[PDB]
Structure formats: C-alpha cells, structure tokens
Amino acid sequence: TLALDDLKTRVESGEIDTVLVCIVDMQGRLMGKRLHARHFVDHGWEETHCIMKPDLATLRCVPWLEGTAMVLCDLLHAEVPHAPRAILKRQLARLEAMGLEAIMATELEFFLFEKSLDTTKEEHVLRPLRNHLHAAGIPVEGTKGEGQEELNIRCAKALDTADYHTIAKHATKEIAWQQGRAVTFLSKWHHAHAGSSSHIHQSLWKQGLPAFHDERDALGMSALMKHYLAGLLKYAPDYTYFLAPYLNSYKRFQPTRTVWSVDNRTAGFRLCAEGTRAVRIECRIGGSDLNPYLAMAGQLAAGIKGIEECLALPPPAGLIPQNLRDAMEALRGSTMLREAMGEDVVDHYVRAAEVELEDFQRVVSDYEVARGFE
C-alpha cells in the first residue's frame, strides 16, 4: 500500500495525476469518481459526495493505469449500513470482540474469450495481470488454468482479501480489455462448459494461534472450529443469496449439499489440510459472480452464531436454495441474518433479490423466442 505523503511526492513529480476514489456496490464493482490528484491531495482525501470518506490505508497505485492511483471509501452522519464493505466490517468487529481474527482467501475463476468484447497466448493477459497486481501490493500466488483461468491470491485478513478480490476482478477486466480480449466472471456462460466458482477458505485466529486447531483432535479440528462449521451448515440457505445473487448463479448447479466432507464432490464445504496448523474450511457454493464482502460477511454470521450456541457438528460423507426466488425468501426469513446484520440491511438485499427477478419479467430472452415457435 501507498503512503499519503508518498502519493503527494508522486503528484508533484507529475507521475500520478488521477486518483480513483471508489466505493464497492452490491454487484461487487468499483464505483466512484476520478479526481485530479492535485485536488485529491489538497481537499479530495478529506471527503467528497455522490458521502464517501476515503480510507487512506487502502491507497494503492494502479499499475495497469497511467498516472493513476486508487483508494477505497467508507460510505456515510454515520456509516451506511447496507454498504457491502460496512456489512463485512461489522461481522469482523464481532469477531475481534471475541479475540478472533478471520483469515481468508478466494479462488477467483473467470473465462478468457478469444474475441474482443466488440500458453504464450494466455500469458499476454495473465502475465501482466500477475505482475501488475503484485506491483499494487496485492499478494498474488499465481494463475492456474482450469479458456477458463483462475487467480490465486495469498490469504490475508478477511477485509484485505475482499479488497484484493475486488481489485483483482477489476484488473482482469481492464488488462484483458487493453489486450483486446474479453473476460467474464459469469458463473455459467454456456451449458456445454464448466461453471466458474469463487471458493472461499476461512480460518479464525487468536493472538497468533490457529483457533481451528486441536493437535489432540482426531483429524485436527478444535472445539471452536467444529462449532463454527456447524453454524455455516445450519444457515447455508440463509446466506445462499450472497453466494448466488443472479438468475445465472443457479445454472452452475447442474457442490450444493448442506454437508461437510474431506473427500466428497457433493459437499458444499470441503475441509482442507486436515491435521495441520493450516486447517480451514472451504465453501464451494459461490460462483465467481459473487460480492466478496457479502459472501464473507454472510458466512461469518453463521460461523459466529454456530459458536454462540455450541452447536454440534454432524458427520461428513439439506440442499441450498435451487433458485433465486427460493434463495431470496430464505434470506427474508433468516432471523439469524436479521439479528446479525439488521432488519433494515436484510430487507434491503431482499428487495435487491426482488428487483433481480422482476428485471427478468421485462426482457424477452432468446430462449423464450426459440422455444416459443413451438
């Protein structure tokens, strides 16, 4: 990350002239304004409207853009509750009031199309992606080909991980564009091809130790981790919507069973690195269309309250909402998320799901037409 005073040298030098002052919307997108950096260092970092308060800890250079830097903001006379960033921070603050620090990672998938939007060949997008992100302070492990690719970023404090996921989403679209190539984070862009997921690894820490670990434990799972996983499991449909916010999200489901497992393909929750310090939980429910903040904040809610009831952990080996109408309702009736996040926030994202279904009633798809000549 980039010191404010450091920015101000880069501005007077004339190396940086743009600061993207962003928040993150429901869709998971960077939204905001593009300030002339002189204005930003003089009164723009203070506050601007749309109110956005820049968080100078989030200030980065943006190597895949000339003269350009960015900062993420808190949206405000207090913090607006249904802002995804704010929603994730709230859960995390619960966690720290218990001495617990969440540590998280995202296996972000996408599709590289050969045409513009209008090994060597892949790397013309992937290599800059890796290199520029790394040069933005984001801890890139690398790329793995699943034209379906995947970006590995080293785990981090959950709020870091969310920012990274977001920024890397952004960088990929931009770098692909500049490379004349399309990229989509669609969970299912076609029937014939694989779904793109966003697997989410999680673990809790306390003052430095892996709270999820009992060296004692049969496979390495401590008391608290079991309560945690049991919560994720109990409330998987409550927050299915934050994993699967669009119509198209449910077509990846052709990894949806409310079970945990260390070997299964059907379990919505894989157990990784059994036996070790790096013991953690993998949620495989989300596709790559998801909002990181919300998906993270949703599970932490379920994980926290799994602990606060000392809920018991069933053996490894019902179903999550199979569509968006069901998932929306499952959120509406989520008295868990209601208390965890607030009645107003839940109602807000319920309405968000409502608008998404209604948006469908107002366009006539190609599939209707084709199937409609009988």
Count Cβ atoms below 10 Å from residue 173 Cβ, excluding itself. 18
Q: Residue 280, annotated ligand binder?
A: yes
Among 95, 105, 140, 158, the residue binding ligand ADP under the rule CB under 6 A is 105
Q: After which residues does the chain become discontinuous at a C–N distance over 2.5 Å?
A: 50, 76, 118, 146, 254, 317
287 neighbors 247 (Cβ within 8 angstroms): no
Stretch 149-188: interaction string toward ligand ADP, x if CB under 6 A = ---x-xx---------------------------------
Give 59 or 279: the residue with its C-beta nearer to ligand ADP. Answer: 279
Give the integer Cα–Cα distance in Å for 267 and 258: 7
Cα separation, 106 vs 166, in Å, equals: 10
Dihedral sign for Cα atoms in the order 265, 268, 274, 278: positive
- Strand (E) positions, 178-275? 183-184, 198-206, 209-210, 257-261, 267-272
Which is nearer to ligand ADP, 181 or 213 (by Cβ)?
A: 213
Say how far apart CA 150 and CA 127 lie, in whole Å: 13
Spatial contact of 322 and 285, defined as CB atoms under 8 Å apart: no
Does residue 201 touch ligand ADP according to CB under 6 A?
yes
- Please tell me whether residue 1 binds ligand ADP under the rule CB under 6 A: no
For ligand ADP, which stretch binds (CB under 6 A), given 9-17, 68-76, 118-126, 201-209?
A: 201-209
Please name every residue paired with 314 in a beta bridge, in sequence order, or none if there are none.
Answer: none
Is 107 flagged in the annotation as binding?
no
Taking CB under 6 A as the rule, does residue 90 contact ligand ADP?
no
Q: Which residue is nearest to ligand ADP (CB)?
A: 155
Tokens of 369: 């037409």
Dihedrals φ, ψ of 44, to 5°?
-80, -30
- Within residues 11-30, the interface with ligand ADP by CB under 6 A covers none
Positive or negative torsion for Cα 287, 293, 296, 297: negative
C-alpha 29 chain-centroid distance: 11
Question: Is residue 193 close enough to count as binding ligand ADP by CB under 6 A?
Answer: no
Residue among 23, 83, 104, 283 that touches ligand ADP (CB under 6 A): 104
Measured in whole angstroms, the distance separating CA 357 from the mean position of its chain's CA atoms is: 22
Pairing of strands 68-75, 18-24: parallel
Asked if 280 touches ligand ADP (CB under 6 A), the answer is: yes
Beta bridge partners of 22: 32, 72
**Using CB under 6 A, which of 26, 56, 278, 311 touches ligand ADP?**
278
| 103 touches ligand ADP by CB under 6 A | yes
Task: Give yes or no for residue 281 binding ligand ADP (CB under 6 A).
Answer: no
Contact with ligand ADP (CB under 6 A) among 184, 203, 256, 288: 203
Complex with ligand ADP: residue 35 or 300, whichever CB lies closer: 300
Residue placing its CB nearer to ligand ADP in the complex, 18 or 91: 91
141 assigned binding-site residue: yes
Q: How far is the CB of 226 from ligand ADP (least distance, A)?
A: 16
The pair of structure tokens assigned to 61 is 């250079």
The only residue of 141, 339, 344, 359 in contact with ligand ADP, by rule CB under 6 A: 141
Q: From the annotation, which residues make up the binding site?
A: 141, 155, 203, 280
Q: From the annotation, which residues make up the binding site for ADP?
A: 141, 155, 203, 280
Q: What residue ranges bind ligand ADP (CB under 6 A)?
A: 103-105, 141, 152, 154-155, 201-203, 278, 280
